[PDB]
């Protein structure tokens, strides 16, 4: 009963100091876990989404929604704790060019979820509006056997909801290019839409 959408509550300033009900904290406090306890919950994502899905494509694009609802949380956290609350800072750049947020995702999102920075970030040289991001080892899909890459898409929805809430409407698609002795190399191609494309030209 604070913001109803029926009205704007009109309340006078400089009232009393009220009681304190719930107080949280926001710094990182780098607390670890075991990769088995992650991979068990990832296979319990997939062991229900195999059950309540009829074809492949809607399984793809509702495994992606779980990653969407981690990406739109994580975008507001990572810049805000990288620019550093009551230890008052000077805030971050709020990046607004497509190869200034790709450097941020490439060097900080993958260094946040995973221990290492992702290795390469490859422009599609022979055309425009495709932007590859690769690694050498997807450490969440690494217990899936076979070759079909539907089980990839929980990480790629983390990418897509990172950009869709950043003002950059895109669409990701993952593929597998087994280059060299890295048999699981697993490119994602970020593929921005047409209606964004004029705006960074002007």
């Amino acid at each position: 009963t604070v913001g109803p959408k029926q009205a704007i509550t009109s309340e006078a300033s400089t009232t009393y100091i009220p009681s304190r009900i719930y107080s949280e904290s926001l710094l990182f406090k780098r607390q670890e876990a075991s990769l088995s306890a992650m991979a068990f919950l990832f296979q319990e994502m997939i062991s229900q989404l195999h059950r309540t899905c009829k074809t492949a494509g809607d399984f793809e694009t509702k495994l992606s929604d779980y990653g969407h609802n981690i990406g739109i949380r994580l975008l507001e956290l990572l810049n805000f704790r990288a620019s550093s609350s009551n230890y008052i800072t000077k805030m971050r750049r709020r990046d607004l060019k497509i190869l200034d947020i790709l450097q941020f995702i490439h060097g900080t999102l993958w260094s946040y979820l995973f221990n290492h920075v992702s290795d390469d970030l490859v422009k599609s040289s022979e055309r425009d509006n495709e932007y590859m991001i690769v690694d050498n080892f997807p450490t969440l899909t690494q217990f899936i056997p076979g070759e079909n890459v539907s089980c990839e898409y929980f990480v790629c929805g983390i990418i897509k909801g990172f950009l869709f809430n950043a003002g950059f409407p895109c669409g990701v698609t993952a593929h597998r290019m087994p280059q060299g002795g890295h048999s699981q190399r697993t490119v994602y191609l970020i593929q921005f839409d047409r209606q964004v494309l004029d705006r960074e030209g002007l």
Binding site: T1, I8, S13, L75, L77, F80, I88, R92
Partner: protein, 147 residues
């Protein structure tokens, strides 16, 4: 009087407040009913126009007095997801946000910390208002102590 609002992605509001001095207790006399949301929704657009400008009309988070209309200035803050913290200031004479410009930058950062703290609840979707009794005390103690 002061009007403060958090405007969402589709321009749908998620927090909506006014707070004002006790000299004029019924604040914003015949503007709060009929101009005060219109000037907010009308002057979202220059804040939206300023989100893709590198230099204004090397921080790009705080924005100054972006509009001045009948002697009411508004101030803005474009967060990382794009929720914009626009706030209308009203007075008797020509109000100055320049006396609080060093101050209330740490009012926008200290409400953006509260928005990040209420984003992390996984039950909280986007495009629904903040029905939080904790949020009101957490914003009005900040409004009382730091104006």
């Amino acid at each position: 009087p002061q009007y403060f609002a958090i405007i969402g992605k589709k321009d749908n509001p998620v927090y909506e407040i006014e707070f004002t001095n006790a000299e004029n207790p019924q604040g914003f006399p015949q503007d709060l009913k009929e101009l005060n949301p219109f000037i907010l929704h009308a002057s979202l657009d220059i804040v939206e126009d300023l989100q893709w400008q590198i230099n204004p009309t090397t921080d790009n988070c705080y924005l100054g007095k972006v509009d001045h209309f009948y002697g009411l200035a508004i101030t803005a803050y474009i967060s990382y997801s794009g929720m914009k913290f626009v706030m209308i200031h009203g007075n008797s004479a020509n109000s100055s946000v320049v006396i609080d410009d060093n101050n209330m930058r740490s009012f926008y950062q200290e409400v953006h910390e509260l928005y990040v703290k209420t984003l992390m609840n996984p039950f909280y979707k986007i495009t629904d208002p903040i029905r939080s009794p904790a949020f009101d005390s957490r914003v009005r103690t900040l409004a009382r102590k730091h104006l």
